[PDB]
Amino acid sequence: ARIGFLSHADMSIHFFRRPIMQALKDMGHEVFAIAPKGNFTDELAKSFHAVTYELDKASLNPLTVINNSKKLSQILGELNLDLLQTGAHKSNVFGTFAAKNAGIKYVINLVEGLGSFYIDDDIKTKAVRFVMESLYKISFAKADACVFVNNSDADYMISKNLIDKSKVYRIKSVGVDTAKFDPAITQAVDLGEKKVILMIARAMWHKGVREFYEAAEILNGYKNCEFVFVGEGFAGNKSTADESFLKGGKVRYLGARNDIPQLLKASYLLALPSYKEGFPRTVLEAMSMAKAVVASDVTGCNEAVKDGYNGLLCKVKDANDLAGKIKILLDDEELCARLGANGRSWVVSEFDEKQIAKRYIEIYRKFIDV
Ligand SMILES: CC(=O)N[C@H]1[C@@H](OP(=O)(O)OP(=O)(O)OC[C@H]2O[C@@H](n3ccc(=O)[nH]c3=O)[C@H](O)[C@@H]2O)O[C@H](CO)[C@H](O)[C@@H]1O
Numbered sequence: 001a002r003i004g005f006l007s008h009a010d011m012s013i014h015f016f017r018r019p020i021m022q023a024l025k026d027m028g029h030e031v032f033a034i035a036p037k038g039n040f041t042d043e044l045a046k047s048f049h050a051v052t053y054e055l056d057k058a059s060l061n062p063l064t065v066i067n068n069s070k071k072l073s074q075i076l077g078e079l080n081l082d083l084l085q086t087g088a089h090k091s092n093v094f095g096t097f098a099a100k101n102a103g104i105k106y107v108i109n110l111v112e113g114l115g116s117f118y119i120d121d122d123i124k125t126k127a128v129r130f131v132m133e134s135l136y137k138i139s140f141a142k143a144d145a146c147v148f149v150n151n152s153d154a155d156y157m158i159s160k161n162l163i164d165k166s167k168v169y170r171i172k173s174v175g176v177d178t179a180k181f182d183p184a185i186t187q188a189v190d191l192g193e194k195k196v197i198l199m200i201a202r203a204m205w206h207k208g209v210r211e212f213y214e215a216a217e218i219l220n221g222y223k224n225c226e227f228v229f230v231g232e233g234f235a236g237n238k239s240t241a242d243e244s245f246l247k248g249g250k251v252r253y254l255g256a257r258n259d260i261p262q263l264l265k266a267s268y269l270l271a272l273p274s275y276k277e278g279f280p281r282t283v284l285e286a287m288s289m290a291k292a293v294v295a296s297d298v299t300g301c302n303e304a305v306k307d308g309y310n311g312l313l314c315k316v317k318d319a320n321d322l323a324g325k326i327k328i329l330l331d332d333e334e335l336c337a338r339l340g341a342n343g344r345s346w347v348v349s350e351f352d353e354k355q356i357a358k359r360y361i362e363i364y365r366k367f368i369d370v
Contacts (some may be wrong), residue, residue, distance in 0.1 A: 001029040004081045006091045008057050010038035016174040019353040020360045069094045077102035082368050096139040106367040109146035111153050113278030119206055136162045147171050149279040152299045173279040175353030181261050181288035188266035194226035198267035200282040203233040203241040208273030214319030216250040223330040227251040264289035269329055273322050277301050284351055287343030292336045294325045310343035
């Protein structure tokens with residue numbers, strides 16, 4: 001009944017793990033939100049027991065990740081947890097090591113996307129990937145189970161003998177609050193009298209930001225459309241667009257926003273031309289708002305979007321194909337509405353957060369009394 005949720009980012013706790021945490025708290029358990037300080041820490045601390053720690057998120061230096069994990073082991077140990085849920089690579093791997101060194105009896109992992117080491121294909125990345133996979137063989141062996149949010153990632157890690165099938169649990173998507181993301185109770189933001197082509201994402205090049213901005217140039221306001229980008233960029237980072245780029249194209253740049261339902265309600269369709277995903281949550285949110293999706297035909301996107309059902313898939317790394325699919329939907333409003341309607345039906349049937357949270361707790365109940 002002391003259950004911790006470890007992430008490298010408070011955003012994953014706040015956006016993704018939250019419904020599991022709330023359901024456990026409503027049951028009377030002590031729930032811990034373990035993540036570096038961020039923009040959601042203060043309010044998380046009101047709902048849950050917020051615990052921060054120092055983390056060099058992207059560093060691969062040996063001593064740094066060691067020193068980080070030893071400090072993390074002490075911070076975890078002081079919480080006297082019964083079970084720890086980790087998510088994503090650093091927490092899954094080094095978090096599991098730290099957790100077991102702290103004497104935490106039960107550890108559940110979570111893979112939601114394989115990430116950048118499976119996009120890049122250079123010799124340096126190929127080697128980091130082999131090391132990560134070798135470490136996963138150890139950390140998965142120490143852990144008690146792993147949840148996967150799509151099928152592709154589970155199939156892959158099984159095919160590489162990283163984890164035994166008996167420890168694999170497939171819970172498709174992290175869920176979305178379909179009662180908050182409900183068009184019937186949402187007031188659209190006023191973005192003018194345009195067909196808004198909306199992309200929501202941290203502005204990583206690996207999210208297809210460049211292709212989105214190029215597609216904007218290609219269509220150039222075709223049929224009264226307006227490309228709109230929601231999310232954060234960063235300066236002096238080779239992996240992300242900076243604000244100069246994000247403000248300098250044929251795209252209305254809104255930065256970070258906390259009114260996503262209202263933005264989706266104002267949109268014509270949502271685009272996600274990502275290079276790789278787990279089960280994209282902005283796609284789930286568009287679906288819940290009955291909005292068609294144009295996504296790249298890549299891992300994750302192509303499980304959350306079935307071409308011709310709730311959206312259209314486009315080739316990855318291809319601004320012309322992205323523009324072409326958006327133009328199809330601008331040219332055919334009935335098709336676009338029909339795709340979004342299917343998205344809403346599907347998300348309500350399969351991806352509401354409350355049932356997904358209950359399925360995580362059923363896994364926890366195999367190990368601890370809940
Ligand atoms: C693998 C990968 O590359 N990404 C995966 C990772 O999420 P990501 O870290 O890529 O997050 P995502 O882009 O799927 O979701 C971002 C979340 O932040 C919200 N938001 C974003 C910008 C903003 O200004 N305001 C705001 O509220 C947005 O509405 C959504 O709820 O894990 C997710 C949950 O399992 C999915 O599996 C993604 O595929």
